[PDB]
Design a protein around this ligand. Structure first.
Ligand SMILES: C=CC(C)(C)OC[C@H]1O[C@H](O[C@@H]2C3=C([C@H](C)COC(C)=O)C[C@H](O)[C@]3(C)/C=C3/[C@@H](COC)CC[C@H]3[C@@H](C)[C@H]2O)[C@H](O)[C@@H](OC(C)=O)[C@@H]1O
Ligand SMILES: C=CC(C)(C)OC[C@H]1O[C@H](O[C@@H]2C3=C([C@H](C)COC(C)=O)C[C@H](O)[C@]3(C)/C=C3/[C@@H](COC)CC[C@H]3[C@@H](C)[C@H]2O)[C@H](O)[C@@H](OC(C)=O)[C@@H]1O
Ligand SMILES: [Cl-]
Ligand SMILES: [Cl-]
Ligand SMILES: [Cl-]
Ligand SMILES: [Cl-]
Ligand SMILES: [Mg+2]
Ligand SMILES: [Mg+2]
Ligand SMILES: [Mg+2]
Ligand SMILES: [Mg+2]
Ligand SMILES: [Mg+2]
Ligand SMILES: [Mg+2]
Ligand SMILES: [Mg+2]
Ligand SMILES: [Mg+2]
Lengths: 236, 6, 236, 6
């Protein structure tokens, strides 16, 4: 693409500069370029990829929710007709969001997942696949909605099965996957009981394994554990 | 408060 | 442009939605489209234009400063050579910033300023012209730097002369212009004494005129007055 | 602290 002429190492370096500058669209474009070099990503490189796109799509999602709320209020009894503009603009943001998700899913499919043999990498990328299908599901309202939901579920489930076999209960990737799959259950799949049970069992299993950890690992694991607890507090 | 993800 | 087929009123409406969503690049593009319809802008519309571009360029400026700081540290005694990447990325951000400034200056020149006859509008647009030349000056390092500085000065000065003749001391536009011209003096023109004297005299003149105001006007004027005081505190 | 503008 436009990054084809730039060295892989330079793309990585610039991704890191973009991160420091909070230039997440640039960060994402640099990491897309790096992925497209065809080489596997290191642990640190995976994190750059994920953070870049998380921030880009997160901004889009937040804008979409503002616009969708305004649209929904426009459809209430007693609201003045204001024309097609709110729908149009919501649709514009939606289409851009969908495009970013499709871009990420395309990187995963060509060829990050298929080349990922270690559980760290494979679980990481399958979690991402679940996340971006989840974001597609958040805006879906038509005949593929069920299929999009199932795609998210499938990816998360595969990642869960690997993570349970291959990673300790306190591994940050395993914990973040469980966190996000629980969010899927609660917010997408109409399965709040499943969400709660997953979050509880994940938390408890991790607590039981903290004793095996160094101080640094302990800090990393207890961080995400707190996110699980935050959702449990909100949902119960 | 929204659900939290990572 | 890409907005040529959209109604003026629809562009305005969508600018307002973009503002609510904090989608400032979209906001700016909608307001560029509205300007390009060729009709003068209302007071409210001017504010949308200015806020949109202020936020876009403000983000770029903040990123540029992070990158320039990293670059400058790379040029210090004992810093490892790391190749052209930091400069390249700073330059990319810089060029994009310059482009946005040139876009804004182009809207002002074709044809917002020439059509603006009321002091509110004329001063507003001349203040913008000074601001965007100021932003160009912040990144300028070569043979046109003096000319860019002079262009900012010229625009600010013209706006000052009109504002003093045509607006009360407490008018928010007059106050914001003085604030920004003082910043110009301090940060661009190497004239800290001029900056301080302008900020003081502006503040004092406004304080003397507050008694003429309604509660609402009072609130609007004392807001910007506090910004003047904040700079005076920082600079003295 | 930077200089403040509006
Ligand atoms: C952009 C990368 C930077 C900011 C350098 O690192 C982000 C962070 O990267 C690491 O932390 C990861 C990590 C996060 C930690 C929970 C932050 O502490 C949040 C991040 O978004 C990131 C990269 C993502 C995930 C998530 C990825 O799913 C595809 C699964 C859980 C979590 C894992 C990978 C964390 O290990 C480190 O352990 C953190 O220290 C650092 O802040
Ligand atoms: C985007 C527009 C919205 C958010 C609707 O309004 C911005 C704001 O618009 C108005 O306030 C203006 C205004 C600002 C006020 C100081 C905020 O209170 C800050 C804004 O950036 C804005 C629009 C800009 C200026 C500045 C423009 O130079 C070219 C000169 C001083 C100041 C004037 C125009 C203020 O009157 C109003 O009086 C405020 O109330 C509202 O928050
Ligand atoms: Cl639109
Ligand atoms: Cl498995
Ligand atoms: Cl670059
Ligand atoms: Cl005059
Ligand atoms: Mg190479
Ligand atoms: Mg009515
Ligand atoms: Mg759609
Ligand atoms: Mg492999
Ligand atoms: Mg028309
Ligand atoms: Mg050395
Ligand atoms: Mg340059
Ligand atoms: Mg006129």
């Amino acid at each position: 693409g436009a990054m084809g002429s730039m060295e892989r190492a330079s793309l990585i370096q610039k991704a890191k500069l973009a991160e420091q500058a909070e230039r997440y669209e640039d960060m994402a474009a640099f990491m897309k370029g790096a992925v497209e070099k065809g080489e596997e990503l290191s642990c640190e490189e995976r994190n750059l990829l994920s953070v870049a796109y998380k921030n880009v799509v997160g901004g889009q999602r937040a804008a979409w929710r503002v616009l969708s709320s305004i649209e929904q209020k426009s459809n209430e009894e007693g609201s003045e007709e204001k024309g097609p503009e709110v729908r149009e603009y919501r649709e514009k943001v939606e289409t851009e969001l969908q495009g970013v998700c499709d871009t990420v899913l395309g990187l995963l499919d060509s060829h990050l997942i298929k080349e990922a043999g270690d559980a760290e990498s494979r679980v990481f990328y399958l979690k991402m696949k679940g996340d971006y299908y989840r974001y597609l599901a958040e805006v879906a309202t038509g005949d593929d909605k069920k299929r999009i939901i199932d795609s998210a579920r499938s990816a998360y489930q595969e990642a869960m099965d690997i993570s349970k076999k291959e990673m300790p209960p306190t591994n940050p990737i395993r914990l973040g996957l469980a966190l996000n799959f629980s969010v899927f259950h609660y917010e997408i799949a109409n399965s709040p009981e499943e969400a709660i049970s997953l979050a509880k069992t994940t938390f408890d299993e991790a607590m039981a394994d903290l004793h095996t950890l160094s101080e640094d690992s302990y800090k990393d694991s207890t961080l995400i554990m707190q996110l699980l607890r935050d959702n449990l507090t909100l949902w119960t | 408060q929204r659900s939290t993800s990572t």
